[PDB]
Amino acid sequence: TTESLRAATHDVLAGLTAREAKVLRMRFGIDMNTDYTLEEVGKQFDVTRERIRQIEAKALRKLRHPSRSEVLRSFLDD
């Protein structure tokens, strides 16, 4: 189920916008070693840090839809 969840999250990040995928990977430590903080993401990508939170809120609003997470609703019990 972990190996299937990896491919499922890879397909979800590939189905969305590529820059959204890079933010969601380098934010929580997906496909990286360390999880970068908000100041480190601000030093890497762009100075504005409130727009990063707006991007995160927009990504959560796009990922609350059941049609894009119907294969992930079965993984909710784990």
Binding site: T1, S4, E70, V71, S74, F75, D77, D78
Partner: protein, 50 residues
């Protein structure tokens, strides 16, 4: 399990029971069930096989 007398068949088969065939061919009926598309994930296939 306990052997049981019955010819019942041709010589190339010998009477394997039902529940042991359900238990021992269980990852096979995950693998040939997830490919054909009667389930979303294998975690749902857990519930669909119990």
């Amino acid at each position: 399990s306990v052997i049981t007398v019955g010819p019942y068949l041709r010589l190339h088969q010998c009477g394997l029971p039902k529940k042991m065939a359900l238990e021992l061919f269980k990852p096979f009926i995950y693998g040939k069930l997830e490919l054909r598309g009667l389930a979303t994930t294998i975690k749902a296939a857990k519930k669909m096989v119990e």
